[PDB]
Amino acid sequence: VEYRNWSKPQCQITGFAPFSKDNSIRLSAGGDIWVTREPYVSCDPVKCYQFALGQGTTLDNKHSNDTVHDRIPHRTLLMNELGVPFHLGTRQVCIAWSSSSCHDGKAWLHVCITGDDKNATASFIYDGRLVDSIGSWSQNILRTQESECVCINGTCTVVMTDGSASGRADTRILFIEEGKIVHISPLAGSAQHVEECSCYPRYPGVRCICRDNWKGSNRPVVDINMEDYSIDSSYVCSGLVGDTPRNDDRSSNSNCRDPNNERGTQGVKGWAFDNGNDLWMGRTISKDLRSGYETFKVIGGWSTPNSKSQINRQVIVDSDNRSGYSGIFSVEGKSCINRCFYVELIRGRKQETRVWWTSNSIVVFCGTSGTYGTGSWPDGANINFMPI
Amino acid sequence: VEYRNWSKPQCQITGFAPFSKDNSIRLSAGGDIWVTREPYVSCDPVKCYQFALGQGTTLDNKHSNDTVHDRIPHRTLLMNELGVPFHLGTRQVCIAWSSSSCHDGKAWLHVCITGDDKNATASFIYDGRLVDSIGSWSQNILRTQESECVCINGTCTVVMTDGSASGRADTRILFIEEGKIVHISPLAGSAQHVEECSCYPRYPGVRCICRDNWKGSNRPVVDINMEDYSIDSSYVCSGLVGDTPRNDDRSSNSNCRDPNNERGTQGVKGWAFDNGNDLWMGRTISKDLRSGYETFKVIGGWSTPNSKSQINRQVIVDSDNRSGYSGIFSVEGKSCINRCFYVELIRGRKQETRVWWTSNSIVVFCGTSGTYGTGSWPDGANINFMPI
Amino acid sequence: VEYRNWSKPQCQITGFAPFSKDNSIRLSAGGDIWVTREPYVSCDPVKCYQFALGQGTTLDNKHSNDTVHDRIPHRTLLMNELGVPFHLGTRQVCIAWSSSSCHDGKAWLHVCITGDDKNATASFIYDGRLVDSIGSWSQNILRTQESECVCINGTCTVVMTDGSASGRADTRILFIEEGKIVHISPLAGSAQHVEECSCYPRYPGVRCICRDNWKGSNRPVVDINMEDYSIDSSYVCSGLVGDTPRNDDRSSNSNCRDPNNERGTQGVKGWAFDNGNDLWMGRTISKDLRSGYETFKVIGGWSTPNSKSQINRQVIVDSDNRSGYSGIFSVEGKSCINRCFYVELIRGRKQETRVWWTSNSIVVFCGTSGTYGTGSWPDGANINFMPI
Amino acid sequence: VEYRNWSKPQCQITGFAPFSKDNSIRLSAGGDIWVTREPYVSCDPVKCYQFALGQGTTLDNKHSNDTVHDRIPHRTLLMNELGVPFHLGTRQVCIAWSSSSCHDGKAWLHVCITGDDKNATASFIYDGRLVDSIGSWSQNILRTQESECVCINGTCTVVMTDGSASGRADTRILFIEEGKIVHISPLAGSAQHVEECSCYPRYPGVRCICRDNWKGSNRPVVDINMEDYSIDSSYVCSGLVGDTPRNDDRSSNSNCRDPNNERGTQGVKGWAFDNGNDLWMGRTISKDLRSGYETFKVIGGWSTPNSKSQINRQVIVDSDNRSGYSGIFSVEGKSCINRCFYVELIRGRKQETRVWWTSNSIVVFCGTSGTYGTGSWPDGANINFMPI
Ligand SMILES: *[C@@H]1O[C@H](CO[C@H]2O[C@H](CO)[C@@H](O)[C@H](O)[C@@H]2O)[C@@H](O[C@@H]2O[C@H](CO)[C@@H](O[C@@H]3O[C@H](CO)[C@@H](O)[C@H](O[C@H]4O[C@H](CO)[C@@H](O)[C@H](O)[C@@H]4O[C@H]4O[C@H](CO)[C@@H](O)[C@H](O)[C@@H]4O)[C@@H]3O)[C@H](O)[C@H]2NC(C)=O)[C@H](O)[C@H]1NC(C)=O
Ligand SMILES: *[C@@H]1O[C@H](CO[C@H]2O[C@H](CO)[C@@H](O)[C@H](O)[C@@H]2O)[C@@H](O[C@@H]2O[C@H](CO)[C@@H](O[C@@H]3O[C@H](CO)[C@@H](O)[C@H](O[C@H]4O[C@H](CO)[C@@H](O)[C@H](O)[C@@H]4O[C@H]4O[C@H](CO)[C@@H](O)[C@H](O)[C@@H]4O)[C@@H]3O)[C@H](O)[C@H]2NC(C)=O)[C@H](O)[C@H]1NC(C)=O
Ligand SMILES: *[C@@H]1O[C@H](CO[C@H]2O[C@H](CO)[C@@H](O)[C@H](O)[C@@H]2O)[C@@H](O[C@@H]2O[C@H](CO)[C@@H](O[C@@H]3O[C@H](CO)[C@@H](O)[C@H](O[C@H]4O[C@H](CO)[C@@H](O)[C@H](O)[C@@H]4O[C@H]4O[C@H](CO)[C@@H](O)[C@H](O)[C@@H]4O)[C@@H]3O)[C@H](O)[C@H]2NC(C)=O)[C@H](O)[C@H]1NC(C)=O
Ligand SMILES: *[C@@H]1O[C@H](CO[C@H]2O[C@H](CO)[C@@H](O)[C@H](O)[C@@H]2O)[C@@H](O[C@@H]2O[C@H](CO)[C@@H](O[C@@H]3O[C@H](CO)[C@@H](O)[C@H](O[C@H]4O[C@H](CO)[C@@H](O)[C@H](O)[C@@H]4O[C@H]4O[C@H](CO)[C@@H](O)[C@H](O)[C@@H]4O)[C@@H]3O)[C@H](O)[C@H]2NC(C)=O)[C@H](O)[C@H]1NC(C)=O
Ligand SMILES: *[C@@H]1O[C@H](CO)[C@@H](O[C@@H]2O[C@H](CO)[C@@H](O)[C@H](O)[C@H]2NC(C)=O)[C@H](O)[C@H]1NC(C)=O
Ligand SMILES: *[C@@H]1O[C@H](CO)[C@@H](O[C@@H]2O[C@H](CO)[C@@H](O)[C@H](O)[C@H]2NC(C)=O)[C@H](O)[C@H]1NC(C)=O
Ligand SMILES: *[C@@H]1O[C@H](CO)[C@@H](O[C@@H]2O[C@H](CO)[C@@H](O)[C@H](O)[C@H]2NC(C)=O)[C@H](O)[C@H]1NC(C)=O
Ligand SMILES: *[C@@H]1O[C@H](CO)[C@@H](O[C@@H]2O[C@H](CO)[C@@H](O)[C@H](O)[C@H]2NC(C)=O)[C@H](O)[C@H]1NC(C)=O
Ligand SMILES: CC(=O)Nc1ccc(C(=O)O)cc1NC(=O)CO
Ligand SMILES: CC(=O)Nc1ccc(C(=O)O)cc1NC(=O)CO
Ligand SMILES: CC(=O)Nc1ccc(C(=O)O)cc1NC(=O)CO
Ligand SMILES: CC(=O)Nc1ccc(C(=O)O)cc1NC(=O)CO
Ligand SMILES: [Ca+2]
Ligand SMILES: [Ca+2]
Ligand SMILES: [Ca+2]
Ligand SMILES: [Ca+2]
């Protein structure tokens, strides 16, 4: 085998077509299915798998009550082939309440994180074995992407943070090269608060549209140069803007340079990608809550400040139901590296209160230069038939 | 590996012998088994798998109530090795309420279809990755075979339709060549309404005995020439005729040229194949309802109008119980390409009303030049022990 | 790969050591486990698997009531790796109420039998695909071994019968050579009623200690010469004698030539093997019922009429609980072909009546030249905790 | 493939980072999970698996009542990939109430033990097939490690005992070389009662920190020279001392030469390893009960009598909950052979009495030269939500 060096032009996509869905919640009312959160999908050259931080339990387990909590010593990273639900036969690849896996092209790398918020650790399991580790620097919930890291020629770069939800955090980018961290670079550029990045190969570099829990609705962008370990950062030019909550199309702004300070203290993991001066992106159809999810093309959104010229939209999840976290994921084509996204459909506590558990099912569309109709693929679980 | 080029003489079969059965419904009253419909089986050179459009749920899930509906955003294409039921560990290969998979001889192709009836899309997932897509042309339930497409030297041909259940539809045949649609040809020949075809390799071409929901009981035939992308069509010569409902042996007819207009607005996916001037075929033992299923050889049925000279019959499913959809499937032998069929044994709503769910189990016999007894292999599930 | 030609001296065993056990019944009261019967184990060069004719249902399924019946259209041949129970994820390799599988050394052969007792068929699935078939000759429950057939250089020989439980049957031996039956030879020798043979390689031939439901307690022996397709037959010389029911050690006899007519109309699948003039063998500890199971070495038992000189006995299953069918199975060693056996531990109806189901779990010891203690490994399921 | 010859310098570890956890008990209240005990993990060059002696049942099976008993004919050795719970789809690799598996570098070896305490046997299944066996020598619960044996160049050494819990036992070390026992050597050195050893490669030899149920809290050490089949033994120099029960840090002692006779009649499987004159080790945080588990580095602990100079400690399992057995396990790195440990988290009868079952879940950290925070990863199962 050789390493993934991703040297192929990004495909010229026309929009998004359907790819996977697992009905996990639907099945949960009639099968021993896990109770996960903050999911994502990644693929090795031959096939894809779906990741998710389970709650160390099943929906029918009374151990589901209080599944809202974000970090318990029992959150383990599950890993199935893309399309097969998290049934008792699922492998818990490692202990972690926050993660990121990528496949250098020879084996898998799994940034797994557990422990006290104040003082947590991060295990770097590569090729099944624990190659290195690192500990909490700012002694405050050392976290990472909750999406897949990316590798180019042997080095895989994961951007992690440790600092303060709504406040100045110490974000840095590790260059774990085959399990062992070969270098660490503090965040450069303008960005004011990088959280849970959605990264993707941009030969010869890596680009990340992230989050910003501090004071921006417009998405942060963290560019890592693979050549010299450098870093740069900014924000998306898009005027539409995509985080949640956010202001609203008419009254939202961004200048690619600073946090817009428009309902900013807030967030949800999102994604996006350039293409010429344009920006393929997607956000919740709702601007206050995580309901529904749309995607569209903002002509100019990449290179021109506050552009609100939208186009090619699509309802992935109708507005009348829940959405959630969202990341990106690439797949090498025979001629070009395609772009794909997934959607976390969360159900349970806080929003819906009939139940005492909080799990989620996924949905994944993929770039396509072909044609396509219209639809809305929600979770589908009747909360009234659900356990608890 | 090389591609399947199917250049082998079709075996000279004597009848049909037993091959698989999964008791899915039987097991459903005592196990987390899925709730599928419109099943089929296909095989790559080494082994076979069984497909089925599940209802994004299990029989015990209250989410089973109303499983009668044909298309919900939750229907995903399941895929197991031939013989292992759709238990929670089954992979949902893609989102689709209508499909067709084939294996060019190097990897699998999966025509998956979801979305609004009015405007649906069709994803062409090949080798795990989404290679292309196409959208609804007549803006009316873009559908396909619900059986396996066939490939010769690299090009795989699936015939799809989009138009009007009982009325003129726009049927066309795509030539997806390794995920990407390399050509599309509108239906030629006489045929008046091709629906859910059962196709099979007929080196150097592909032949399809399909359905006809408009005005025929006799089965349509769609021949695709692989050489020039052409098309031709007609109807089976058989006087016995095999759709449902249909008239009845004595009073049924066909002339290989036009819809017989004998209870025609009606249908069920069926299959058949030539052999000299003869026609191996199978239909429900009942001519009004889908109960039971028989097979036999009509001497002349292929090349001579309205032939009712039957022979070599066999009861696969006794008349006293349910049958359903049915397709064909080929398997390369060491010297000849064998012919095989499967039977959808449906249970649940509308017909049986004790329950509120509608699932099905399969049965599959395969051509054989050997000897064989007689039997009847139904579903076997006691509807009185069944959930709901 | 090459074929198994078994040219190695049989190991010089000292007795039997433990190998597998699946606790299937025990697990059945707390898991979706199948309801099988007439089990057996076989191995391909690399590993072993365990076979069993399930009842097309689980113990918790109400579909378990009446699982006593021997042949229903729903009995399918299950196949797991040696040691993993028949859980919903088990593959139903084919439809069959009587079978025999062997592995020529390149792929598997599965003699599967279903259909009407009067007129049943026998599918010969080889390398996943149906290669041939044969139909019922004496129009009376065409059956076979319920153990593994054996192959030498490409030809695999299964001995089947069709005739009359307690009466003259037409037993014959097929020489299915890679799926296709290359020859059939009627039973020769003295034997008066061969039923469900336990066969084993005896380079360059195959030997079978079978059953005799007609008028013998002493076991039949069917030798097949691979060289010329011939056959020969007789009975074991052993005076101890091992079928059930049988007379009793003191008053039991045999002369290697004729049925002893000592409680003969009766049977249970058993096994045994030579070694010089001696005979390794095993029978139920009880001589009327199937309770318990023992093994021992009869010095002379092979070559000398009515020898009752026993030695090296062992209680595999203590007398206070159920046993059942039993077959043999070989395994190639690095220097010699080892001999192994398995024991069907049946539970359920007729004998135990608290329940309405009849399933079984297995136990398997294997030859050993080493040392070993003593024990008793029964089923272990508390019938009072069991479903129904 | 080649054999594992382990010729690499042991890594220079800084402490322990998280690796796996299976939440088995947590899942048991909502899934068909097995009821095991005395677990362990081992890895072949490519990946790891987790072993455990199940109780031939599930927690929901009424067959769980009385799962406290240590040896029943139904205890079978389960084997899953590291991270996937013991769900019905788990393979019972053999019959055994005491075991040890290792992988010579070409295939697996499984020392499985069952039978009467008085007269038990030990099957040596290698490469799937039973290669040899041995019987009970002192006719008293022939037992072994309950951890993984180790192999160097083709010979795998397991140290077994048979004798008297609290009294002089006959411990010996077998040198099973590819299934067949090529030599046996009685225990040499000073050690007074070796029980369930935790062994590890120390090129060109093997070292074992074991137990001592007789009259020591300080751990026994059994060194096996691979070169000449010799043996040597002693006790750890550490003054901290790690068994349970034990005296207490201030008042505990050891001189590397004799049993300390400090609460000695007692035990629990533990582990430890040298590093220069130092000793990496771990024990329960409690000195009377098995609650909690800690690890630390005793500077000098290896080469200097009664050293109590501790350092680098860590709470793996907080003191407020249960721990249990513990073994070691090695993993070859790209440059050095890393050291790892696992912790048996037991739940059920005797200690906790709300329930009638006694199962356990595991936790596994692995050596690391990196950094790491602090945490406590217990079982997590709310005994009040648990079955029975
Ligand atoms: C491909 O296919 C699309 C499908 O797009 C998406 O449509 C779904 C529904 O919106 C969405 O959830 C799914 O995920 C698809 O991706 C084709 O067009 C689209 O489909 C429908 C119908 O054309 C549009 O749906 C809207 O939402 C309501 C529910 O479906 C519907 O009621 C809305 O219509 C109201 O306005 C119409 C005129 O537009 C009017 O006739 C009615 O009055 C109607 O009723 C409301 O209005 C009144 C009060 O305000 C009262 O009558 C009554 O109380 C009621 O509340 C609306 O139609 C969807 O927006 C539409 N267009 C698009 C661009 O998606 C599309 O043909 C094709 N396009 C592409 C690019 O492939
Ligand atoms: C191989 O084996 C076949 C098996 O073929 C199929 O038979 C099953 C039953 O029909 C079918 O479900 C299964 O799937 C097999 O594939 C051998 O022959 C066949 O088997 C039976 C018996 O010979 C035939 O079955 C028919 O269906 C009824 C249920 O089994 C049965 O009652 C029918 O018989 C009535 O007529 C007979 C004479 O034919 C007469 O003796 C009785 O009176 C009987 O009773 C009814 O009639 C009266 C009122 O009308 C009253 O007595 C009473 O009220 C009752 O209702 C009939 O026998 C099946 O048709 C038959 N033939 C064939 C060609 O399949 C076959 O030997 C062999 N063939 C081949 C090609 O391999
Ligand atoms: C290896 O290990 C064997 C184990 O062999 C098998 O023993 C188990 C029990 O029989 C069997 O189920 C398991 O599968 C093993 O494979 C060692 O020896 C064997 O073990 C026991 C004890 O030595 C023998 O068991 C017999 O069965 C009864 C239950 O265990 C037991 O009660 C019987 O003993 C009666 O007789 C003894 C003297 O023999 C006497 O002291 C008592 O009185 C006892 O009690 C009954 O008798 C009276 C009324 O008749 C009353 O006292 C009271 O009411 C009660 O009913 C008997 O001991 C087993 O037979 C024995 N021998 C053998 C050769 O297996 C063996 O050491 C070693 N051998 C080898 C070849 O490896
Ligand atoms: C990396 O991160 C460690 C984490 O180490 C371990 O800490 C967990 C809790 O002990 C453990 O279960 C987990 O597995 C970790 O591996 C960082 O430091 C450690 O964390 C905490 C806080 O610093 C320490 O925990 C102790 O245990 C109690 C529960 O957490 C806590 O209440 C204890 O504190 C009592 O003393 C403090 C001063 O120490 C005082 O402020 C309070 O009064 C407090 O309250 C009790 O005392 C009074 C009565 O006696 C009353 O106030 C009241 O009734 C109450 O009972 C204590 O803090 C843990 O020991 C600590 N240190 C270490 C070295 O682990 C560490 O920063 C970093 N280290 C490394 C090497 O990476
Ligand atoms: C990126 O990876 C590809 C695959 O390793 C490299 O291209 C291959 O190697 C040589 C030199 O380019 C050619 O003969 C092959 O035909 C190439 N493979 C294919 C599929 O075209 C490529 O050089 C790598 N490096 C860069 C910088 O792109
Ligand atoms: C159809 O496929 C077969 C397999 O690729 C082709 O035949 C093989 O290739 C060469 C030329 O025919 C022969 O030496 C081999 O012996 C053939 N294989 C076998 C199993 O016979 C065949 O040419 C393909 N093309 C056509 C048009 O049939
Ligand atoms: C039985 O099978 C074995 C394996 O195919 C044959 O022996 C091998 O082939 C040649 C000729 O004997 C030797 O160089 C190899 O060393 C043999 N293999 C082994 C493992 O010894 C053997 O000839 C076959 N035929 C017969 C009649 O025994
Ligand atoms: C231990 O095992 C290794 C692997 O088999 C042996 O080293 C390899 O073999 C030759 C001779 O040493 C070298 O060319 C290879 O480069 C070695 N492999 C690696 C990865 O370095 C080694 O000799 C074995 N024996 C001993 C005593 O260490
Ligand atoms: C470790 C962890 O709590 N991850 C999260 C997951 C979801 C959410 C969320 O609110 O959906 C938040 C966090 N935490 C943060 O991002 C804090 O800035
Ligand atoms: C997509 C879809 O509804 N497929 C079907 C499946 C079964 C049936 C059926 O009636 O069994 C019908 C359809 N639809 C049509 O064929 C309409 O002409
Ligand atoms: C097909 C079938 O019934 N197999 C059997 C299995 C078990 C038994 C049994 O009685 O255990 C009997 C049979 N049948 C016969 O052997 C009749 O001679
Ligand atoms: C075979 C067996 O009983 N193994 C054990 C497991 C656990 C324990 C235990 O007490 O945790 C004890 C034993 N037995 C012994 O070690 C006797 O010295
Ligand atoms: Ca924000
Ligand atoms: Ca019609
Ligand atoms: Ca008899
Ligand atoms: Ca002790």
Residues of chain B positioned with their CB less than 8 A from the CB of C136:
373
| Closest-approach residue (CA) in chain B for C139 | B373
At B64 the three-state DSSP class reads helix
- Chain D interface includes C381 (CB < 8 A): yes
Establish whether C129 is an annotated binding residue: no
Residue D230 Cβ contacting ligand 8 at under 6 Å: no
CB A209 within 8 A of CB A219: yes
Nearest to B176 by CA among B263, B101, B233: B101
* Residue identifier of the C-alpha nearest atom 6 of ligand 9: A70
CA B357 to chain CA centroid, Å, is 22
Ligand number nearest to the C-alpha of C254: 15
Q: Which residues pair with D10 in a beta bridge?
A: D337
Residue type, A218: N
- Chain C interface includes B163 (CB < 8 A): no
Residue type, A217: S
Nearest to B219 by CA among B179, B264, B249: B264
Burial label, D305 (beta-carbon count in 10 A; 0-12, 13-18, 19+): middle
Mention every residue, 6+ apart, whose C-beta is less than 8 A from residue D69: none
Q: What are phi and psi of B201, to 5 degrees?
A: -65, 135
Question: How far, in Å, is the centroid of ligand 3 from the Cα of C343?
Answer: 22
C-alpha to C-alpha distance for A282 and A243, rounded to whole angstroms: 9
Q: Which helix (H) or strand (E) holds D196?
A: strand D195-202
At A170 the three-state DSSP class reads strand
C-alpha to C-alpha distance for A113 and A102, rounded to whole angstroms: 15
Q: Which residues pair with B326 in a beta bridge?
A: B343
Q: Which residues of B are the active-site residues?
A: 70, 325
Sign of CA dihedral C68, C74, C77, C78: negative
Establish whether C347 is an annotated binding residue: no
Ligand number nearest to the C-alpha of B39: 10
C-alpha to C-alpha distance for B146 and B304, rounded to whole angstroms: 29
Residue D2 Cβ contacting ligand 8 at under 6 Å: yes
Query: What are the C-alpha distances in Å from A297 to residues A13, A147, A375, A377, B36?
Result: 10, 22, 18, 20, 37
CATH number for the domain whose boundaries are D1-388: 2.120.10.10
CB B323 within 8 A of CB B345: yes
Angle at C41 between CA C30 and CA C365, to 5 degrees: 85
C-alpha to C-alpha distance for C346 and C56, rounded to whole angstroms: 17
Question: How far, in Å, is the centroid of ligand 10 from the Cα of B268?
Answer: 8
CB-facing half-sphere around the CA of A245: CA atoms within 13 A: 7
Ligand number nearest to the C-alpha of A99: 9
Q: Which residues pair with C17 in a beta bridge?
A: C366
- Chain D interface includes A58 (CB < 8 A): yes
Residue D315 Cβ contacting ligand 4 at under 6 Å: yes
C13: its two tokens: 């065993």
| 3-class secondary structure per residue, B165-209 | CCCCCEEEEEEECCCCEEEEEECCCCCCCCEEEEEEEECCEEEEE
DSSP category for residue B63:
G
Question: Domain segments of chain D: what residues?
Answer: 1-388
Check B61 against A23: CB less than 8 A apart: no
CB A174 within 8 A of CB A181: yes
CA D366 to chain CA centroid, Å, is 15
Mention every residue, 6+ apart, whose C-beta is less than 8 A from residue A256: A234, A235, A236, A237, A305
Q: Which residues pair with B221 in a beta bridge?
A: B209, B234
Please choose from C365, C374, C376 the residue to mutate so as to test ligand 3's pocket, defined by most ligand atoms within 8 A of CB.
C374
Residue B73 Cβ contacting ligand 1 at under 6 Å: no
CB C358 within 8 A of CB C29: no
Nearest to A322 by CA among A293, A283, A364, A355: A293
The DSSP line for D273-298 is EEETBEEEEEE-SSSSS-EEEEEEEE
- Helix, strand, coil % (nearest 5) of chain C? 0, 45, 55
- Chain D interface includes A336 (CB < 8 A): no
Residue D374 Cβ contacting ligand 4 at under 6 Å: yes
At D370 the three-state DSSP class reads coil
C-alpha to C-alpha distance for B378 and B319, rounded to whole angstroms: 9
| Closest-approach residue (CA) in chain B for C54 | B23
DSSP category for residue B380:
-
Angle at D123 between CA D117 and CA D125, to 5 degrees: 155
Which of C42, C331, C372 to mutate to test binding with chain D, by most D CBs within 10 Å of its CB? Answer: C372
C-alpha to C-alpha distance for D197 and D271, rounded to whole angstroms: 8
CB B286 within 8 A of CB B346: no
Residue type, A293: Y
- Chain B interface includes A278 (CB < 8 A): no
Residue A177 Cβ contacting ligand 9 at under 6 Å: no
The DSSP line for C218-273 is SPEEEEEETTTS-EEEEE--BSS--SSS---TTT----SSS---SS-S-----EEE
Nearest to C257 by CA among C287, C226, C216, C296: C216
Check B62 against A367: CB less than 8 A apart: no
Burial label, D258 (beta-carbon count in 10 A; 0-12, 13-18, 19+): middle
Sign of CA dihedral B107, B108, B109, B115: negative
What does this entry list as its resolution, in Å?
Answer: 2.4
The DSSP line for B209-240 is EEE-TTT-SSPEEEEEETTTS-EEEEE--BSS
- Chain C interface includes B30 (CB < 8 A): yes
The DSSP line for B241-271 is --SSS---TTT----SSS---SS-S-----E
Q: Report how far apart the first and last C-alpha atoms of chain B are (Å, whole number).
A: 49
Question: How far, in Å, is the centroid of ligand 14 from the Cα of B267?
Answer: 4
Question: How far, in Å, is the centroid of ligand 8 from the Cα of A323?
Answer: 54
Question: How far, in Å, is the centroid of ligand 4 from the Cα of D293?
Answer: 16
Establish whether C264 is an annotated binding residue: yes
The residue written with tokens 């021992």 in the block is C296
Nearest to B210 by CA among B223, B222, B202: B222
CB C370 within 8 A of CB C35: no
Q: Experimental method used, please?
A: X-ray
Q: Which helix (H) or strand (E) holds A28?
A: helix A24-28
C-alpha to C-alpha distance for D105 and C163, rounded to whole angstroms: 53
